Structure formats: structure tokens, C-alpha cells
Amino acid sequence: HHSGLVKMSHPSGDVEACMVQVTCGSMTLNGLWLDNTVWCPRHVMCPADQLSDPNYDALLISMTNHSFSVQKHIGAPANLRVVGHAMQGTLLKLTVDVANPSTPAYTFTTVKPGAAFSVLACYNGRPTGTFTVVMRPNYTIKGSFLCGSCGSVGYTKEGSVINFCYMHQMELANGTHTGSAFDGTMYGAFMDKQVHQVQLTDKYCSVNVVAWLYAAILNGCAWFVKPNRTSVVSFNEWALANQFTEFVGTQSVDMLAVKTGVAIEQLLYAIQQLYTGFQGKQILGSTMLEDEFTPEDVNMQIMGVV
Amino acid sequence: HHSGLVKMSHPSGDVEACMVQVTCGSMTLNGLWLDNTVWCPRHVMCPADQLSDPNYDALLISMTNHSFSVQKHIGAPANLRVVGHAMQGTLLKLTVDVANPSTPAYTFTTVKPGAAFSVLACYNGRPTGTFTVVMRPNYTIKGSFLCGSCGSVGYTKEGSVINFCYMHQMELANGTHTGSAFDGTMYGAFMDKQVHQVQLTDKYCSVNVVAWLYAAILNGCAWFVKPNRTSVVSFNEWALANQFTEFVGTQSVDMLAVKTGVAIEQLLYAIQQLYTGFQGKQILGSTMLEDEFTPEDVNMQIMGVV
Ligand SMILES: *[C@H](O)[C@H](C[C@@H]1CCNC1=O)NC(=O)[C@H](CC(C)C)NC(=O)OCCSc1ccccc1
Numbered sequence A, B: 001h002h003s004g005l006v007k008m009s010h011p012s013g014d015v016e017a018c019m020v021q022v023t024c025g026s027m028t029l030n031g032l033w034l035d036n037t038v039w040c041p042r043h044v045m046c047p048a049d050q051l052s053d054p055n056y057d058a059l060l061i062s063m064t065n066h067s068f069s070v071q072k073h074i075g076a077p078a079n080l081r082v083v084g085h086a087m088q089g090t091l092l093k094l095t096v097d098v099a100n101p102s103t104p105a106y107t108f109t110t111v112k113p114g115a116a117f118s119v120l121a122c123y124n125g126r127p128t129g130t131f132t133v134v135m136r137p138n139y140t141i142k143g144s145f146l147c148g149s150c151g152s153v154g155y156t157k158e159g160s161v162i163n164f165c166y167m168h169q170m171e172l173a174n175g176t177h178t179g180s181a182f183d184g185t186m187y188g189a190f191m192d193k194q195v196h197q198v199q200l201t202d203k204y205c206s207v208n209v210v211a212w213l214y215a216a217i218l219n220g221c222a223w224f225v226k227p228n229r230t231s232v233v234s235f236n237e238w239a240l241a242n243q244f245t246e247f248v249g250t251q252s253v254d255m256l257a258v259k260t261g262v263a264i265e266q267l268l269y270a271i272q273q274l275y276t277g278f279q280g281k282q283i284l285g286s287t288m289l290e291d292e293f294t295p296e297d298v299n300m301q302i303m304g305v306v
């Protein structure tokens, strides 16, 4: 039995219409054009001989409006003249002379560990792929980004409003990725410098494992459900010693409990048992715990509830 | 180490601009608007009391142009007046009075087992998600489709040309999905009738397993590579008895062999060994063979080659 779960991204068209190419000196990457503003990573200003320890304050003062070339390629093409520039954290805010006529309704938000978002991967201002990731507990994502991908954006969508939450910046030593929020902060403890950095330990996202076990029950797979129960408090004590995030319930999880008639505490017990071993059994085609699907994914994809 | 692989879909904007809602009687689903033509599943004509054994020839003759209501909701809205109608296999071709001003360059093609394509899942003519699937050897896909999803489309993209290959029709007993090609044929042996149908056995897609093992080597994971080799001919004899597709090499696979210095026949031997058991070892975080990534996915996502 197929679970009915796929990695589901938002339709990307609203965001595709906002992507541009930004060039500064010897650097080119992507930017996001909303109203009269183009956002892009500030390391587009960095010469290759400074990438390991840039002085971004001095680089910013060294730029003029002529330092930046901004072009839109796909769809309605345009060359955008930069008329102001500013730095916010690890992002540049370029002011341009033309307002994007296809600016969607949008907000800026920060995504939290365990939450999913959609990524539009772009090179030279041209969208090339879309995928969805969950923010890991160590503030990396398991993405797919190559040279030239910086400035690619991540977002969620509520109704017609696009909530931009990620601008791609870098690849870590273990092949995961991180970037900035649109307040300019890097996710986690990372810095936008090309030097090796301490990377924190990842953890299983307990609330997403619970979601996946509910997806299994919703698919008729419940061999792991027992009368036994572990309290949230007891589970969370256990989680700290076993590389799991502490569990915090949500109405999304509560809907899954009501639909299945299986209590959260039953699944917290099952996780503890499954972590010691699946004993050769499979859950939704897997012999290990899955934490890349959220309670919202399961509600939406299986239960039809948004 | 993260593999650098995600489920990567095409940007969906070009196709979003083609989706419409088609209503006929008590049925509503999605259609695809290209030039002056709207394509949709023919069971939109079926009354609920005929779904198990429709007479589609008689249903078609019973329709007039007034029988169909076609509306575009998102983006540039329009109500489209139907001025002709026709049946091609399991699809209707509605001719409308307005040509889609955002018709992309496009072709129609049929996708083959093991090949990947992008799906734009739509409800009531509104795109709601995108995901990528591989056509299974039994001509189903492991999708995520609910009531109202019929007429959702699947496609590949070469350059700027969209190759439409799938229009969603139905869900099988094991939760997988199938649909039609735009020549109107159902994939596999399926019929667009709401009756239980024999479903063929699925198989591992050997060429995609080889691709994934190459992805592992490209990530520094090669413990399973041994000097031993199995010829393509010998492997394919073995595959028929062990629920694998027969392996057919491509230039995409050959590039992976050249890049890694590991021969295809070495990986065919490794597959045979891994199928008997991983012996507690992991490959790219998995204890089972992965066949949902193509040689092209690995070339593109890891090697940067399109
Ligand atoms: C921008 O397009 C690019 C994106 C990466 C290239 C390969 N895949 C990517 O995701 N970003 C960069 O090249 C980074 C620029 C810095 C922030 C100024 N540098 C980068 O990712 O270098 C990685 C090695 S340095 C490092 C090592 C370990 C932990 C942190 C940083």
C-alpha cells in the first residue's frame, strides 16, 4: 500500500515572477524582486580574495548604485536600474526604479525547526527546480543547491499570501545547506563567510515522527500501536538523552488523534520502542523513523484538510 | 553526509497558467487550456449512476457545447465558451472561443517506466501543489491525489518546451494512481471505469537503482563496490526471477561511470548482493534499495549536468 504521501511543494509561479539576476563585480547570483526592492545575499559584493573574511561594512560603503546590475530574464524581461542600496544583516536591499508588476501578496517570516517550506532553486536568475524541505533542529536544510544557487528563496503560503522565510547562502561540510531569513539573520549560529564552521548535531523531529506514525494508522498500518503510553513530560525527558526534539502538540496533531482514535501518548511510547529497533518490520515501506513529513502534510495529503 | 538529492520538480508557473475548471452536469474537475483547446478526462460527462460502466460513445453524443462550463480562476481570469467538443480515447478535447494567451511551447509525449515527471495537483481549476514521481513498471505512480484532482497534469521540460505526458484519472486499490497520455490512452492496462481492476506487480527499476548507487559513490559512500562484476546479460536473466526490471544503459548512466571510475557491471553485482541483504549497513541513509531517482537526476543534482 502506497501511503499517499509525496514531498509536496507549493505551485511556484507567483515566486518565479519575482526572480532576477544580480551581478556585482566578479559575482553573480539571484535576487528577489518585490515592489521596488531587490533582495539578495550580501556576499555578491565580495571579491574572491576576501570570501573567507569579508569586511562587509567597508564593502557596502565601497559600492555605488552603478556597482549592481539587475536583470530579469524569464517572463516579462526587464533591466532594472538600481537607485539605492542598503544592508540588512546578511542581505542587501537594492532599491530599483521599476516596481515589480507581478508582486504577489507577501510577508516575511522565520521558519522553525521541523516546519516545512518550499524552495525555488534558481541559477543566473532563471528558476530551474522546486522542492520542499523541513528546517532541521540544527538550522540546516537537506537541499539540492550548486554553485550559483545563492539568492534562491524558500517560502510558505497561507491563502494567496506568500510568506518568504529563506534566502540561500551556503553549503555546510556535511552537504546540508543554510541561509538567511529576510530580517537578515542567518538561521542558527552560521556566518556568511567562506570558512569551516562548527555545525550542531541534528536530531529527530519528534512531532513529525508522530505525524508519520499517524499517517501509517490512516493507511491501515498500526501494528506498532499498543495500549501502553508515555506521557509528554516523560517522553521529553527521554528525548533529551536520545537525540530527539522535545514534543510539543498542536491542533494539527490533535486532529490526527481524533481521526484515528489513537492517543499521542500511545505513539510517544511506540517511538521509544521503534528507536530500539523495528525488529524486521516495516512502517509505510520504511525500516527507520521518518521525520520529514509534518502534521500539516498528513492532514492535507491524506485527510484533505488545509 | 546529506546526499544532495531531493525530489526536484520543474518550476510550475508555465503550466499553472494553463489550468482551468471544467464542469459538466454533476461533475467538476480540471482541464488543460492550450491554444483554443481544453483537454480534460472524459468521465466529467459521466452521471454518478453510470460511473462503473459508462457508455462514453453515447454520453458524447448526448452532449452539446452548452453541456460544458469552463472557467479560469487564478491569474488572468476568464470564462471560456465551448464551441466544439470531441473525444480522443479517455480524454475530451473541447474547443473554446479564446486562445490561451499564455500557451507555452509544448509537445505531447508518453513517459516510460522508470522515468520521472512533474505533477501539478489541482482542485476546481486551482493549482494546489507540485511533486515529482517516476512511472512505475506497472504503469502506476505513487502520487498524492484526492477527490477532485482529475485533470491534474504531469509533464517534463526540455529547454523552454513543456512535454505533457500525464492527465490524472484514478486511484488504484493499493493507493497508487494512474491516468492518461494526451493521445487518450490510459497508461498500462487500466480502464477509466469505477470498477475494481487487476493491478500488475511492481518491480524495482534497475537503472534507477544503479543511478542511486552512483550517487552514493559521488558522495564518498562506496563500501559496496567490489572488483566483482555481473554482465548486463547475466543481470537481466537474474532480474526476471527477482522482480527487477531489465537494465538498459544510457549515456546518462555512462557519464556517471566515467565520473566515478566504477563500471556498471560492478554495480549490477552490488545490487544482487544488496538484494540479499544490507547486513546492517546503510547507503545514503537507507537500508533498502532506492529506485526513485533517475540517472538524469543524479547527473543534474550532484554533477551539475543537464
Ligand atoms: C552561493 O551560490 C553559494 C552556494 C553554495 C555553492 C555550492 N552549493 C551551495 O549551496 N554559496 C557559497 O559559495 C558560500 C559563500 C560564502 C557564504 C561567502 N560559501 C560556501 O558555501 O562555502 C562552503 C565552504 S566554507 C564553509 C564550510 C563549512 C561550514 C560553513 C562554511
Ligand SMILES: *[C@H](O)[C@H](C[C@@H]1CCNC1=O)NC(=O)[C@H](CC(C)C)NC(=O)OCCSc1ccccc1
Pocket (backbone or CB within 6 Å): B029, B043, B051, B145, B146, B147, B148, B149, B150, B151, B169, B170, B171, B172, B173, B177, B191, B192, B193, B194, B195, B196, B197, B198
Ligand atoms: C477524479 O478526480 C478522481 C481521482 C481520484 C479520487 C480519489 N483519488 C483519486 O486519484 N477519479 C475517480 O474518482 C475515478 C473515476 C473513474 C475513472 C470513472 N474513480 C476511481 O478512482 O475510483 C477508484 C475505485 S474503482 C477502481 C478500483 C481499483 C482499480 C481501478 C479502479
